[PDB]
Amino acid sequence: KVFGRCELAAAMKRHGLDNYRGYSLGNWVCAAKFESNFNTQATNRNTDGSTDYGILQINSRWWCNDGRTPGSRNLCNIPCSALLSSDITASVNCAKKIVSDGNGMNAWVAWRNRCKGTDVQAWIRGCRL
Ligand SMILES: [Cl-]
Ligand SMILES: [Cl-]
Ligand SMILES: [Cl-]
Ligand SMILES: [Cl-]
Ligand SMILES: [Cl-]
Ligand SMILES: [Cl-]
Ligand SMILES: [Cl-]
Ligand SMILES: [Cl-]
Ligand code: NA
Secondary structure, X not given: OEOXXXXXXXXXXXXXXXXXXXXXXXXXXXXXXXXXXXXXXXXXXXXXXXXEEOXXXXXXXXXXXXXXXXXXXXXXXOEHHHHHOOOOHHHHHHHHHHHOOOOHHHHOHHHHHHOOOXXXXXXXXXXXX
């Protein structure tokens, strides 16, 4: 599924991401925009042989199991394929663990490079929330 901006914002809010660990909803929407372009099916192979999965590009080295990332953990206890669902519950549940891991949203390199410090509230502008 390719979410609409305000559509994803509403789903993230429903699922308890707005202000989770202090990060406003615009931060999460901005991260999803630059990680996956709002596409739940997005996958991206990393140079280390791990893969990033779903609307928040959660990575198989630590967070999910794909059976093909040697030495990796599965700290969210989910198959990475669960992160590709039209329903964002698994991705949100796992994002909450990630953002609680110590470095906040700096875990998402596209957040740090493209969202952090910007006017992130623009991403939820005009949304009925
Ligand atoms: Cl957009
Ligand atoms: Cl915001
Ligand atoms: Cl593996
Ligand atoms: Cl493969
Ligand atoms: Cl594990
Ligand atoms: Cl699995
Ligand atoms: Cl959803
Ligand atoms: Cl933080
Ligand atoms: Na893994």
